[PDB]
Symmetry: C3
């Protein structure tokens, strides 16, 4: 179709292959041969315009569907290898993607992309901001993107919910654009401003089923964002609708298996949240160099995977996290990074003490551990490292604050000496029926049931009772002081005194 690969990096000139690519896509769609091959010629193919991958005129709504509930409009664009074929893209504006998937939502389409590189004509410096998008996905479902490279654009992968439903005059924003179920495997992004961007402007909240696996993301050192989930609030102006979770980007049930590489010099950003929620995600994440997680508002991110980093990971929150839904902003199976020191209210849990979750296997070698006992005798032991002065604590928390503000109730001590009711007085113990004994107001040792429980039996004597002014032992009943303590009283007299001698002194 007249496409040649003669891009010259030195002069930044070459043949514009956007028209040839569009003609190839249209011819592939028209004849139902839904695939276009781009061989690895002598140089890169210079492209200045967007490639729709579904043909010009397929920008939104329901695509043309056959009798089998499937979109007929689409092209599988593939090359020769991950770096064998090179596409040099010159974006007309900031949001122009080299490759896009726009149109039919709810069903599969033959649109796919593999084995090539989206890679810029103009390489913007890390100090400045770049323009262009690597791959755009709006209103598309089941669009595989496998074995591709993306380099130094404003956005590497852009999940978008932009268009509003054409039959929505009452502004519900419930029928329209939503992006779900996209497969991205073995994809590299190199120093983009936002490597992955979930954005909704006038579409639905749904971001469901999109999967990342075997991918690496190079976070830009100068304030780059590895992953962003945000709502621009464009539909807020049309309908205020002052409700917190109504206008959000709902990233739920998506897979995030990405190896992140950040910077140890200029505080790069790992995750950015702005009116969006990551709920019930999964996948294992890898981080190198220092990164920080930014949360704006009460919104949060929760995943069923785990992340590991040979680094220090920082966290910044620009508001009060919605504690009525999640304890902390960022959660995983192994760590929850927004760790805040205890507020100065609990006598034991004081300021300067920070809570950290279990980690489920004591990989840190310094935390508590759960163990079972096997062989003959059986039991369960949960243990702490030596030197832990606080010991084992039974505590409680409020709904307003989950981890900070934990109120200690019971303490068992490191040295195994005292069981202490830290926040309550008059502690005691009793049996199944409820009869028992305990303390009362720092002064009394009492039985719970009045005139029921006896001190000592003929089988189990006590051998002595020593009080401040009396002692009852083998020597007899004698006071501590001489001749000041009486036996009986003028109004409360004893009866008969049976003694062997029969005479005082």
């Amino acid at each position: 179709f007249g496409a040649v690969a003669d891009y010259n990096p030195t002069t930044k000139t070459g043949t514009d292959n956007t028209q040839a690519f569009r003609n190839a896509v249209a011819a592939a769609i028209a004849q139902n041969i839904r695939n276009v091959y781009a061989p690895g010629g002598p140089s890169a193919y210079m492209t200045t315009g967007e490639i729709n991958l579904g043909g010009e005129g397929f920008t939104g709504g329901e695509g043309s569907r056959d009798v089998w509930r499937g979109i007929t409009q689409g092209v599988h664009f593939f090359g020769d290898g991950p770096y064998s074929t090179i596409i040099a893209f010159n974006p007309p504006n900031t949001d122009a993607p080299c490759f896009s998937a726009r149109g039919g939502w709810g069903t599969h389409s033959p649109r796919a992309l593999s084995k090539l590189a989206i890679e810029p004509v103009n390489w913007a410096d890390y100090n400045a901001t770049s323009s262009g998008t690597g791959v755009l996905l709006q209103g598309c479902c089941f669009v595989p993107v496998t074995d591709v490279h993306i380099g130094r654009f404003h956005r590497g992968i852009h999940f978008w919910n932009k268009l509003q439903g054409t039959d929505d005059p009452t502004n519900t924003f419930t029928k329209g654009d939503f992006t779900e179920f996209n497969r991205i495997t073995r994809v590299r992004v190199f120093n983009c401003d936002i490597d992955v961007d979930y954005q909704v402007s006038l579409g639905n909240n749904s971001f469901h089923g999109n999967s990342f696996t075997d991918c690496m993301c190079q976070i830009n050192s100068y304030g780059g964002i590895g992953m962003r989930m945000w709502d621009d609030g464009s539909r807020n102006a049309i309908r205020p609708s002052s409700l917190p979770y109504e206008y959000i980007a709902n990233v739920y049930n998506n897979k995030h298996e990405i190896n992140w590489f950040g910077s140890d010099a200029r505080t790069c950003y790992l995750m950015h949240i702005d009116k969006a929620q990551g709920r019930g995600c999964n996948g294992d994440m890898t981080v190198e160099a220092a990164v920080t997680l930014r949360a704006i508002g009460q919104y949060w991110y929760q995943s069923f995977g785990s992340l590991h980093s040979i680094s220090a990971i920082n966290t910044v929150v620009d508001g009060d996290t919605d504690t009525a839904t999640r304890p902390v902003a960022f959660m995983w199976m192994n760590s929850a990074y927004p760790q805040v020191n205890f507020d100065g209210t609990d006598p034991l849990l004081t300021s300067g003490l920070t809570p950290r979750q279990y980690d489920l296997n004591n990989s840190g070698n310094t935390g508590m551990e759960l163990l079972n006992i096997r062989g003959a005798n059986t039991g369960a032991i949960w243990s702490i490292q030596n030197g832990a002065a606080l010991g084992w604590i039974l505590g409680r928390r409020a709904q307003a604050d989950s981890r900070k503000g934990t109120r200690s109730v019971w303490q068992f001590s490191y040295n195994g000496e005292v069981i202490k009711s830290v926040s309550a007085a008059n502690v005691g113990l009793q049996n199944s029926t409820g009869a028992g004994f305990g303390m009362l107001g720092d002064t009394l040792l009492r039985p719970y049931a009045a005139s029921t429980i006896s001190l000592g039996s003929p089988t189990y004597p006590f051998t002595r009772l020593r009080t401040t002014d009396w002692t009852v032992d083998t020597n007899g009943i004698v006071p501590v002081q001489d001749g000041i303590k009486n036996i009986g009283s003028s109004s409360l007299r004893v009866g008969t005194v049976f003694a062997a001698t029969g005479t005082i002194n």
Copy 2:
């Protein structure tokens, strides 16, 4: 080979390409060029018969093996894309697959399939039952199925162990058909009656190593089963062998990473178990809309992954689950759905109370949480939300019933006031040597060792002893009533009384 793509959906007529496909497969096998290409012509290829992918006559047993322990019989059938090439399949009967992998077990074969769609000529209504199979896999190992679509068949993926060993006259069912180690990536199934079906009739129990990743399953609303594992009991008739786990489908060490979409109207089914066991599986599962898990008998399913759903998930069990092996029928890292309320036996754990596992990170924001203390002082705290009246309980369970029937032993109370032996009386405490003090039968406070432990010391007095009829304090030793209580007895007399006065009254 005479194959054309001219299927007409309106009239449901076209050229039958099953013979051309079979001829292409045979020619590929004969010349050892083990690949057949199906381009995306103007329409779908109409197929009426089964494609063996290993040639006609390769239905079971050991395949032809070279000097390198590998099957020589096989074809890699690939097209142009996930939806670029369309195959319209007309099943002769219910169990006829459009594509199959039958034959050699235990080693690899060049059989593979990718980039196409198994998609029906006759679209059965969701009310009625469909006929045909998308992909059949029996007695095959290492058959990759990548980037394919399957639509509205009786079965989408059918793992089968059908044929019995030809050299098995004593009916052991230990040598013969078993399916293991199959790779299924980026595969869609659309409203099939059973999306994935593990079935064994006269073969071995082995279903090992089969992996699902980056796949979505659309569960049929009208009683569709997303995943089924079942034995039809055909070998039970030949040899009764009344043993529970001998004749089962053993789905072990398989990967199940599937995004499920169900229905909120007509109770679709997620997993069905009928004389089969899922043991030591893994993978993360996604569910949307309401689904229910059905378990028939004592059989169970256990996985090392987790599943998440924005929905309510129901569970039905048609018998007593085998508690001697697993606590509940369905288990995961984050949830175990067969949650049954406590039986009305424990005084604390009463009916209307349901147990739920830890969830390992308190993602529900309402459960207990494990925490470590960091910085200077160190300790461990496991805490509960405010309002939990039952507090922290130490309980025990029987082997017959794991979670229901838990017997409470110790209670520590929410308000930090009493340590209660819920199911036992005569509670107490003692030191390392075993000497100590406690209760005895709701009436006695006793030391464990007779005539050993003394009440009070000169260093630590008690200042008073108040009984029902006596009190010993600074005022002296005086009774509660006047002139009825005696000092000594006629048979048990005191000795000498040393008093400063020397005269009564």
Copy 3:
């Protein structure tokens, strides 16, 4: 390029296609068409020399990089299918690979390999040692290896850090060869001596981001190693530098999702560690038949995944594991296999008792379990199976030994009768202010604060005090023996005795 596929297994003769393959690779590199196609001819292609996949002369250092931070030297070598194309490799020596990736580190290269088999001309017996390498990867990043087979070589996959930096005269070994970020999907290895080998000789410690997924490894029965991570100590001779973790193979943040099949007869090896550390890995592992994990020295392996096996897994350690970093040598989310019986020091935790971690869901049906209570009343219960005589124990551990050597501090008993300070005497309890009561030296029952806490109140009497020689009850104050016990003393006299009678006896 003159390559033909006419290998004869019977005579082990054929045309040597190594020169044709090298010429094809060079021609592909020169014209920037970075892909070479190997169709599935009548037989296997006989190769006697190494294929560089980057051209002859590309053995290390930084590769030729364009203006876009990427290597221009490379070839994507692909065939027709996993077993459609066969390469019969005759290794000149032990370390000769059929396919290799040598050269530029830190950036991506167009080097890739897919859809073929590395498979030997000379099949060595399982008794003897084989020679050759399937795929070698040194100083290469982002080299995908998908859908390939490897058979009976000395090494299947060899990650290597061999070459030292040419500008390193002071022998720091910090600048030079390191292998990171390699993708290996759907790859089979059949009875190799070492299926996967991480080795560093004169390069950096970095082994980061390499991922294994959907792969199976057949461990050789006669002492085969499924996975090895080791340093040969070649740089130790140049610079002694007697530091433990300086010269190691750092396998960190790598994905290990491999289904292992071992042997139940001749003790095959699963993992071998020799001056290397696996830190922060992930992935789910499958094992069949008996395997053993070997650890040499203080080095360890830690992963964020889980492994399952229908077998018994053994563990051998050839030294004292570095407990200052990890508790045990091998750790996972579900198990930690180096389980050693308790040392004979704790009175409760005696020899013959072995600790095992929680497993997070009680999948073993025999261990303790964490549960939440839902519906109206709320609480938390952690429970043990019936018959566990040891009950619930609060214990502590030293840094030198994590699990063995755990010291029991508190016991709560199975029968809910005694709270025992196992390793300490003089146990007691007190309220928030610290005033309370307890034991002291097996003999005394004392209040913590002197002359503060009183025994009994007018509201809560005790009805009796029974000592060895006295009893105070409704009958009065009477001794246990007749006429030997006195009221008062010669030096410590009582005052006035108020009695109704006025006469002794």
